[PDB]
Write a protein that binds this ligand. Sequence first.
Ligand SMILES: Cc1ncc(COP(=O)(O)O)c(CN)c1O
Ligand SMILES: Cc1ncc(COP(=O)(O)O)c(CN)c1O
Ligand SMILES: Cc1ncc(COP(=O)(O)O)c(CN)c1O
Ligand SMILES: Cc1ncc(COP(=O)(O)O)c(CN)c1O
Lengths: 425, 425, 425, 425
Amino acid sequence: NSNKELMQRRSQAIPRGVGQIHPIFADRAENCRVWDVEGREYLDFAGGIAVLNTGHLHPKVVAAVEAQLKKLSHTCFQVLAYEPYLELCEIMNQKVPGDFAKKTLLVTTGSEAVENAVKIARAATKRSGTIAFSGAYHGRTHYTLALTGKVNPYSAGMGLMPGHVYRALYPCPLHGISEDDAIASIHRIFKNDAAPEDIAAIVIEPVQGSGGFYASSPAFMQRLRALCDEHGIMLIADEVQSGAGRTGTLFAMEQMGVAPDLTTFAKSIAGGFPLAGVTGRAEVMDAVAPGGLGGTYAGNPIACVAALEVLKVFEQENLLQKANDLGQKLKDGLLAIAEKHPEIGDVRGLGAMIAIELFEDGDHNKPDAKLTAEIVARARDKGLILLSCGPYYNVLRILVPLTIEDAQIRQGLEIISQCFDEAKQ
Amino acid sequence: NSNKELMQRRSQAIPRGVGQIHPIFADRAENCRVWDVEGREYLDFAGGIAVLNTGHLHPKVVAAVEAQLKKLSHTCFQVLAYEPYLELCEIMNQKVPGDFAKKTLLVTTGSEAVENAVKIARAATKRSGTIAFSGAYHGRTHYTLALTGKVNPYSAGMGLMPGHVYRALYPCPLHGISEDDAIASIHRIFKNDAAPEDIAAIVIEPVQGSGGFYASSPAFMQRLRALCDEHGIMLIADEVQSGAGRTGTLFAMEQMGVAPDLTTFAKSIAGGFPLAGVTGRAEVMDAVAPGGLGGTYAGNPIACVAALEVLKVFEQENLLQKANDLGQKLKDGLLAIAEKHPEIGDVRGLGAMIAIELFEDGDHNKPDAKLTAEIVARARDKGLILLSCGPYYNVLRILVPLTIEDAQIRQGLEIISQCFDEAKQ
Amino acid sequence: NSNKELMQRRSQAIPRGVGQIHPIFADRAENCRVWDVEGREYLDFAGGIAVLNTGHLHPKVVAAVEAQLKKLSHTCFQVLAYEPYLELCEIMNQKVPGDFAKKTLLVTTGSEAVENAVKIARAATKRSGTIAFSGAYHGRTHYTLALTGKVNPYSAGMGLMPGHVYRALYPCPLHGISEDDAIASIHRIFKNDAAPEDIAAIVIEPVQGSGGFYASSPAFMQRLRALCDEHGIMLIADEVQSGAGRTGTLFAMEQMGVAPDLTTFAKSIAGGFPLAGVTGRAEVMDAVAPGGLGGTYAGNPIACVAALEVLKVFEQENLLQKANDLGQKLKDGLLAIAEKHPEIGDVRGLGAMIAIELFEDGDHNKPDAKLTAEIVARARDKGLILLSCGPYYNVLRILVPLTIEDAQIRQGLEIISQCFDEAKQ
Amino acid sequence: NSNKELMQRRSQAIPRGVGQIHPIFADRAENCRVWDVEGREYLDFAGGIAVLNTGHLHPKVVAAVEAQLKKLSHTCFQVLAYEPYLELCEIMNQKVPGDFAKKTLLVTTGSEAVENAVKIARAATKRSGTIAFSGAYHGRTHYTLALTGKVNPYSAGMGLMPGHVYRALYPCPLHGISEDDAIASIHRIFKNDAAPEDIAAIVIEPVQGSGGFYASSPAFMQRLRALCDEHGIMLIADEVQSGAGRTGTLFAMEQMGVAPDLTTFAKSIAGGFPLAGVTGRAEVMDAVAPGGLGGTYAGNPIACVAALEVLKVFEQENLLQKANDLGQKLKDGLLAIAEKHPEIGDVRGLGAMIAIELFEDGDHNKPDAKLTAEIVARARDKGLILLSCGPYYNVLRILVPLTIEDAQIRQGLEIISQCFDEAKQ
Ligand SMILES: Cc1ncc(COP(=O)(O)O)c(CN)c1O
Ligand SMILES: Cc1ncc(COP(=O)(O)O)c(CN)c1O
Ligand SMILES: Cc1ncc(COP(=O)(O)O)c(CN)c1O
Ligand SMILES: Cc1ncc(COP(=O)(O)O)c(CN)c1O
């Protein structure tokens, strides 16, 4: 077939609303390699957007999936239960940070995970409002669009999203927002628009993904934890992207020295299959009356075993450790590039959640959304699949599977090195 | 390895909010048969809630999945596209009622589907309000919970869901709501709370699911269509549960005599794998700006080929036909047991979407909810998995796979027969 | 100094949003008489919209007001208190129906009264939702427009008004809506959009004003009281228009057999001066924290002494008894005019809150809005100021001062008779 | 006839929600003097809260009031028009800054004004959102409470107020908020929660009253003007308190260098009688369909003539000029008392809108609400009525009539001085 031929049909059958980063149709993939319908091979650094921390179709994961496929694919837990769902919950309850009893709900998409986390926080505290941070991303349902700190294009032309969501400033010294500023912004909400007694939860990404890979410091999370504690507000850690080991630990919160009340997870949790969930303080999770929580596909059988296997593979294969190594390699590699390309104004990242911000002529005030896109474009023509993000589209985030070999690591770095040289000429 | 023991583990690991219709754990299934961890075999008349119209792990579908499983399971379409997604959209564009160009978007869940169809309608009309009907069910997200016409237990303790969702009366003579009343109830909204110019769309289930399997007549649907046409209101047909040939036609709207501007689908579409989508008037679908639509697992690769394979199966095994028969057989068998039992006040159903509503002493004023629950429990004792529904939890709805053998149908009616005769001794 | 001339200046300096029922500039008035800038005299049957029950410039009221002008006109009660405010509250605490301790807050307009009654009901119950009825009118502020069961023209073109206000049907048998349907419409909200525990109050007009002068029956009002009681919902009675003894009792609720938790009042309470208030169960009133209620002009000194004087008149001049007699004289006179003209399909009203509803050929489903508007126009030509109301604008309501002359009663009815004759001619 | 006796009666008849700054009952007043029911004479430095810039019962104003009182007090302009209303609008149309044609709507309270200003902006832009500033105050109706940047106590226990109101930062270097930060806070809203095209207006006090008397600079207001121009957003200026000559010019905006699209006025416009309004771009004002703007008491006759006379009094008595002289003297006298007491960390104000902020040990981080509150008590014992304000209740504002005599200005400063000295040991 042909990529362009498939793109033409795409434009005829699918709405333009559905964006398309790379105009390539994949055919097969394996770990870090992807082959398009034209037979061309690529080194995947987007990882399906952090969904493949274990790589494309990890064998142990596929094996489990094939086995379950001989048994059953769906029943809808709420009608007839099944062990995989039960077993995954039990494991999340103990792996998700929190020195106390927890319970886990399994849904299907990261959006639904956040939707439920807030629902549960509201039923628990008996309050309606929530607070979210600038540059945050939490999903594409009406309510999660309101939580998401970005209107364009996610809400464009649709009108105002749900109310009673209040905006706080995410800490980010790189741009003049001090942890004191972030904390102050929360009190501002309490004083100006919504008293604590009306705030059911504060939703935050320990490390923002779509936001441009900006991380919270242990100190700030601790203050946030104290503030929430003082007002009986549930702290929700959206770990949909930062979770499943991307930061060096299974969940980023672990590195914050403090525990959330509720945690959402998805993407890499199932290494390539549709699964999401909420894990939180047991009594909070139970605040909802029976029949209150649910969903048809929720905690799908095949995805459950894949999740279980992903968790096994993480231990058997030492991914958490590799996640740190990989980040250090990419970070050193990228810094070597930064010594001959001032346009790269910052190399940051926790574990393997690495990213670089492109500024025009060094200046930390001139986002280069054009060079960024050029780098992506050039990178693709060289067989490297990259992704960008951040409120000013000048951030390159690397989400390559943790299972990547050193050769592919050097390979990718090299390709990114040229993209810049060939882009200054 | 015991249902009881697993149920106890469940209470310690999973929230009570996730209801449990049957305290049984399924180990494996095949078409209409299901075996638990203990070994007991049941006959599934619930089909994972209208999800398995082609039966559990249908052989042709399973092979397709297995094939795709060797290639890839996820890339995130908006990043790297793939043919199965593109192909299905093309077929749905042709399969969904409406003699005009259409475009399709693939999401993951029925909730996401309705969510996007509303976003789409809003962007297209530049309006924020929506009208849904009493007894409707559209999802467990904040917004789809507002759309759903039932607070308990879906919203209990959570507070009020997003506003700007107005309630209309779903036509239902069996309870005193004439079609005229229904259309009038819509004019009431226009006069009292939200003018037509502020209503983006009117969402409706051609045939309500949890609502009690009540169906709209072509006449009504037609006035509804004319009313929307007059005001530029997008008519949304939520066919998440009525679709996939459950009523005889692939979509219930086909039998209504008019096309909707937007249609949502899920459940049986992929016969047991996580997938959902929205098909609508091309002009409308494109109203959303590029990058405004999308979800991480959207139109999952494996789920897609399963759906493609399910559509082939429908055409090859005449499932649309078997549905109409199966439905007729059920009605008759039930109408029979209704002779000896006045408790069965009504036996209705479109295609294979059949149901019976139990009443206290044949009194259409006293909904016998306790009797309903009684039969459910009794059928399970005799190996039959049934489901109840309706605003008064007094309705029994059959969602048995269309691929059920003639014997299992008698075997089914017999079991239900026993239950009624035994509950009356 | 010409009407037409002043109207041209109007269009030039005042917004057209401010509708002008009669293109006339009143220069002076006295009891039921009004003279325009051209010197023409009119008989006032609108009464400034139920604001002048004691007539234009009642001698006793004006005298009281003049005395107060010599002392002070404003201080802002919450800053420096004054006695007229205090005295009026003590009196309202006794006069407002309800056999138990009460407390009163004084604001300035009817809309503020309703705003404050809901605020109070919310603080007292810890709930946010409210239920109002079809055809209801509660004010022009954002929230009260939401409560008002009429979008056009009040909130026309402004987008949707505040959410979390649900709509119930007002009992109106003339138009096929039984008290059973009305109560039922409330349970429908409880099951479909807002559970009792989220509803702070049910706001209702004992007799709808703008809504068509449709009155509630004691039987209905009673079922409503028990309903609220069962769910701890505050029953708010908006008597801004039905109050001030327009129905035969100081407050219409007195005739219902039950007492509300809160009652709003304005218009006639002060006989032509800016004043309004909320009276209710003491414990409910005190629910709002200190400093939570207030308003610059609230309970203005002149308005208060004016209201104190209005109350004496009602007592000294047997106005309630007069309201009842006046009502009968009017209805009988109207009933006679109807024996000739079939168009008049209804003649109703408690006390002096009288109105007639016109139909096309007496077809009780053909609101003859055109004729209603014509009768108004004709009456104006004959020196009779009238007002139409009702959802379909086919209702003429009489709000002539209770201090009307026997002769003016004959004259009003006569002019009306002429209008229906000269029109049907 | 006893202050305490009346306070006792108040506690039994009126809800505690209604605060009480001074537990004194005024009997009569004249210009800047008030006498309680016990005969004690105080000097009024609060002015009914900026409502009496022409003093208590200004002889000219009263005379005007009495004349109208002989003609008519109410008709409801919507029903029968009258000249005082028309005439006042024409004068307002030309007095309010703006080289374009303007139209004026008259209502009754400042809350109604802001409410109406927003409805008009909404119809004109066909947008629903609004932006307001931190520490702002706009009224006590539901919607105006949401606009108001202060939850406590204005809405405690009540729950969340209407949404789709976003918060921007009011510029205030004295406390860290720069003009750039304020402008940045608005873009932030545009980027995170509500796009410019969904924002109908930006509401702002040229000089925050309740907020603590912080003035906006011309430069800042100009950037705000340009920003609204760029996005078709109506700029609403709330001059309810800053209006009517308090700042040295009739409207504070005159001193800003730009014109708003809409202006709300109240308080001192009528010198002690219930009246408020909205004056704005004519075509904006006319966006509301006829019949969409009303209010029973709206632009009351007596109050209208009072405003017309007040405006005349400002001219013949040179109040604007006196306002500036009064401000200077006060500020000089206060800066004097500020040399013996470091608690007075700031002396500010435009014209006669003067306020002093008290910090602890002159620590611009230690708001001394205790002292501030203590100064008010001592002052009242010395026959002087004062008021406090500010988000931290550490600001003393002076709203004494501009008609104050020179000796009364000394008397006031001497007393205020005597209050700070005595509060030292
Ligand atoms: C932090 C975060 N939260 C929620 C979501 C939404 O999840 P989904 O795309 O699976 O709906 C994403 C998606 N990239 C995310 O990064
Ligand atoms: C009509 C209808 N709409 C939407 C949904 C939500 O779909 P899901 O459970 O897959 O989220 C359902 C599920 N029972 C449904 O029946
Ligand atoms: C029942 C009722 N409530 C509230 C209002 C509003 O009162 P106001 O015009 O004084 O704000 C009216 C009058 N239009 C009314 O009739
Ligand atoms: C800027 C401002 N806006 C609105 C209002 C509300 O005015 P009112 O109390 O007359 O309703 C006030 C008065 N506290 C005010 O100072």
